[PDB]
Design a protein around this ligand. Structure first.
Ligand SMILES: CC#C[C@H]1CN(S(=O)(=O)c2ccc(N)nc2)CCN1c1ccc(C(O)(C(F)(F)F)C(F)(F)F)cc1
Ligand SMILES: O=P(O)(O)OC[C@@H](O)[C@@H](O)[C@H](O)[C@@H](O)CO
Length: 585
C-alpha cells in the first residue's frame, strides 16, 4: 500500500505491558535506549542530575557480566584495538602514500577533527610529515556548526573520501558512527571494502552489529547493518575491523554527543597513542599498553566528578541565566576553547536553543582585545561566563578578560586544569572564590606536547560542559522523563526517533502515529498517497522548517483530534510542556 515500502521495517507498538515481551525493547539499539538510571531525570535537582550523568558516563568503563554484549574492557575489544594499532603501525613505517582518515557526522565528525589535529601535532613534534586527516558530514564548516541534515547521503560520504584519498597508496579509514547509523559513514566503509588493495576500513560505534541501522538509505543500495556485517566477516582476514563496545544508553536518550562522543576519544586516542608510542620502541602494541591508557582515562572520570558540587552550582547559574533570558559564554584557550564551541553549538539542535544561549569562544575564534571590544559590551547582570584554561595557558591574557568581564557580569565561574603543585597567580584570584580546580597527578609521558595530559583534560572539560549544558536545560522543564520530545526533525534518524516517541508516549498503533506525524509535518496539506509514499527526506526537509511538530502530533493522537484542533489547543495552553504533560496525565 502507499507507504508500506517506507514504514515496513518499523516495529508495531506493543500492547500495554508487553513492551519487553513483544521483544520490542530487545530491538531498540543500545544507543537509542532509555537509560533506567534516568527515568526521572526531569524531576532530579541539579545535584542529582550531576550524579545521574556521572553514573551514566561511568558505564563506559563497566565490564561485561557473565549471555551479554562485549564492552570496552572485554578481551574481544582490546584484541581488536591491538590488531588495529598494528595496522596503523605499518602506515607509520611507510608514510609515503600513507594516510589515516577519521570520519563521522555531527559529533563523531567533531571528535574526528580534534583527534586528527592531536596526532598531527605529535608527528610534527617529532618532525614527521602529518598522516592524519578528518572528514565531517557537510565539509569543514560542519566542525563548529549545527548541521544535522548532512549525514544522510552515502554518495556525499564517498565523494569526501575520494577527495582526501588523492593518489595515496595505503589509506586507513576510521568510520565513526556511534549508532552504527550515519549514511555518510556507511558509503565510505562500503567503498573501502571494494578497494582493499588501498583501503582499510575500521568502523567505530557502540551497538552490536545486530543492532546496526537497517532501514534503506536513499542514495545507496546496502544498509549500515549489511556493511557492518560484511566488515566483520573481513576481520577474520584482518582486512576490516569493527570496534563496537557497548557503553549503555545515554542519560538523555539518543543523545550520542555525550557518552558516544566521549567513548570515541577514549577508544581512539588510546589506540593510536599506543601505536605511535610503541613504534619508536620497536615493540608491538599490547593490551597492557592500551590498558594503561584506558585506566588513566577511567581515573579522569573519577577526578572529574569529585568536583560534583561545583559542577552542580555552575549548572544552576547556567540554568538561571537562561531561565531569565540571558546568555552563557564559554571562554577557553586552545583545544578547550574549541570543545566549548562544540558544546554550545550542539545545544541548538539538541535543545532547540538559540545560538546565543550557550555560545563558545577560542582565544567563534575571537582574539583578546577583539572579545573585549566586540562581545564585552553585550554582557548583563543576569548572564553567566565560564572560563576554561590550564595553568599553562598565558594567564595574563586571562586575568584581563575576567577583570573586565567581572564588572559587567558577576556570575562568572571557572574551569582550570593543573599539574599538582602549580598555584593560581593572584592569591586574590577570587575573581574566582570557588573555582573548579582540576588538579592532575604526575604521569610519565615521553612525547613532547604531553599528549595524554591533553586528552585527559579535553575529556574532562567535555564531561563538564556536556553535563552542565544538558543539565541546565533539563532544569528548565524542557526534557520529558529522559527524552527530548520536542526536537527538530532535521535528518532521517531524528524522523525515526520522533515516530518512536509518538508510539512510546501514546501507546497507539504505528499507522496512527505515522499518520499523525505526517499530518503535523505537512499541514495544511492533507495526506495524499504521494506524501505517504514519499522518501523520508521529503518529510525531513519540510519538518525541518517547523516548530512543535512532535508535540502537535502527539496531542492530535492523545485527544484523538485533528491537527487544526491540536494546534488551537496548544496555542491556548500556557506552554508546550504543560500542554503535553497535562495531556499525558
Ligand atoms: C521508529 C524507530 C526506531 C529506532 C531506530 N531508529 S533508526 O534511525 O532507524 C536507527 C538508528 C540507529 C540504529 N542503530 N538503528 C536504527 C532510531 C530511533 N529508534 C528508537 C528510538 C527511541 C525509542 C524509544 O522507544 C525508547 F524508549 F526506546 F527510547 C522511545 F521512543 F521512547 F524513545 C525507540 C526506537
Ligand atoms: O555518530 P552517529 O550515531 O552517526 O550520530 C551522528 C550525529 O547524528 C550525532 O553526533 C548528533 O549530531 C548528535 O547531536 C547526537 O547528540
Amino acid at each position: 500500500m502507499p507507504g508500506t515500502k517506507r514504514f515496513q521495517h518499523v516495529i508495531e507498538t506493543p500492547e500495554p505491558g508487553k513492551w519487553e515481551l513483544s521483544g520490542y525493547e530487545a530491538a531498540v539499539p543500545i544507543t537509542e535506549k532509555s537509560n533506567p538510571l534516568t527515568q526521572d531525570l526531569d524531576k532530579a535537582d541539579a545535584e542529582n542530575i550531576v550524579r545521574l550523568l556521572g553514573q551514566c558516563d561511568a558505564e563506559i568503563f563497566q565490564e561485561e557480566g557473565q549471555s551479554t554484549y562485549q564492552r570496552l574492557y572485554s578481551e574481544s575489544i582490546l584484541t581488536t584495538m591491538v590488531q588495529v594499532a598494528g595496522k596503523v603501525q605499518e602506515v607509520l613505517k611507510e608514510p609515503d602514500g600513507g594516510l589515516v582518515v577519521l570520519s563521522g557526522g555531527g559529533t563523531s565528525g567533531r571528535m574526528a577533527f580534534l583527534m586528527s589535529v592531536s596526532f598531527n601535532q605529535l608527528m610534527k613534534g617529532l618532525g614527521q610529515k602529518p598522516l592524519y586527516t578528518y572528514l565531517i558530514a557537510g565539509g569543514d564548516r560542519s566542525v563548529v556548526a549545527s548541521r544535522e541534515g548532512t549525514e544522510d547521503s552515502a554518495l556525499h560520504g564517498i565523494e569526501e573520501l575520494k577527495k582526501v584519498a588523492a593518489g595515496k597508496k595505503r589509506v586507513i579509514v576510521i568510520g565513526i558512527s556511534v549508532g552504527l547509523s550515519a549514511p555518510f559513514v556507511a558509503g565510505q566503509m562500503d567503498c573501502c571494502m571494494n578497494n582493499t588493495a588501498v583501503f582499510l576500513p575500521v568502523l567505530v560505534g557502540f551497538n552490536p552489529v545486530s543492532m546496526a541501522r537497517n532501514d534503506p538509505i536513499e542514495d545507496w543500495s546496502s544498509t549500515f547493518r549489511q556493511v557492518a556485517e560484511r566488515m566483520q566477516k573481513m576481520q577474520e582476514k584482518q582486512k576490516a575491523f569493527v570496534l563496537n563496545p557497548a557503553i549503555g544508553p545515554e542519560g538523555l536518550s539518543g543523545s550520542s554527543r555525550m557518552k558516544g562522543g566521549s567513548a570515541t576519544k577514549i577508544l581512539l586516542e588510546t589506540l593510536l597513542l599506543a601505536a605511535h608510542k610503541t613504534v619508536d620502541q620497536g615493540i608491538a602494541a599490547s593490551q597492557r599498553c592500551l590498558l594503561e591508557i584506558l585506566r588513566t582515562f577511567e581515573r579522569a572520570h573519577q577526578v572529574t566528578y569529585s568536583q560534583s558540587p561545583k559542577i552542580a552550582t555552575l549548572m544552576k547559574s547556567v540554568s538561571t541565566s537562561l531561565e531569565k533570558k540571558g546568555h552563557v559564554y564559554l571562554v577557553g584557550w586552545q583545544t578547550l576553547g574549541i570543545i566549548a564551541i562544540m558544546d554550545g553549538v550542539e545545544c541548538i539542535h539538541t535543545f532547540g536553543a538559540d545560538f546565543r544561549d550557550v555560545r563558545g569562544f577560542l582565544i567563534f575564534t575571537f582574539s583578546q582585545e577583539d572579545f573585549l571590544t566586540s562581545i564585552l559590551p553585550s554582557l548583563t547582570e543576569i548572564d553567566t561566563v565560564v572560563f576554561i584554561f590550564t595553568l599553562d595557558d598565558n594567564l595574563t591574557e586571562v586575568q584581563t578578560i575576567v577583570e573586565q568581564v567581572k564588572e559587567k557580569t558577576n556570575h562568572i565561574q571557572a574551569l582550570a586544569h593543573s599539574t599538582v603543585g602549580q598555584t593560581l597567580p593572584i592569591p586574590l584570584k577570587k575573581l574566582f572564590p570557588s573555582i573548579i580546580s582540576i588538579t592532575w597527578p604526575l604521569l610519565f609521558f615521553e612525547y613532547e606536547g604531553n599528549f595524554i595530559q591533553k586528552f585527559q583534560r579535553e575529556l574532562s572539560t567535555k564531561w563538564v560542559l556536556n553535563t552542565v549544558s544538558t543539565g541546565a536545560h533539563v532544569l528548565l522543564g524542557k526534557i520529558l522523563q529522559n527524552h527530548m520530545l520536542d526536537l527538530r526533525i532535521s535528518n532521517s534518524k531524528l524522523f525515526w526517533r520522533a515516530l518512536a516517541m509518538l508510539q512510546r508516549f501514546s501507546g497507539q498503533s504505528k499507522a496512527r502515529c505515522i499518520e499523525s506525524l505526517l499530518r503535523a509535518i505537512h499541514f495544511p496539506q492533507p495526506l495524499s498517497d504521494d506524501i505517504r509514499a514519499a522518501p523520508i527526506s521529503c518529510h525531513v526537509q519540510v519538518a525541518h522548517e517547523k516548530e512543535q511538530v512532535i508535540p502537535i502530533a502527539l496531542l492530535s493522537l492523545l485527544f484523538r483530534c485533528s491537527i487544526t484542533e491540536a494546534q488551537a489547543h496548544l496555542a491556548a495552553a500556557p506552554s508546550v510542556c504543560e500542554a503535553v504533560r497535562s495531556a499525558l496525565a
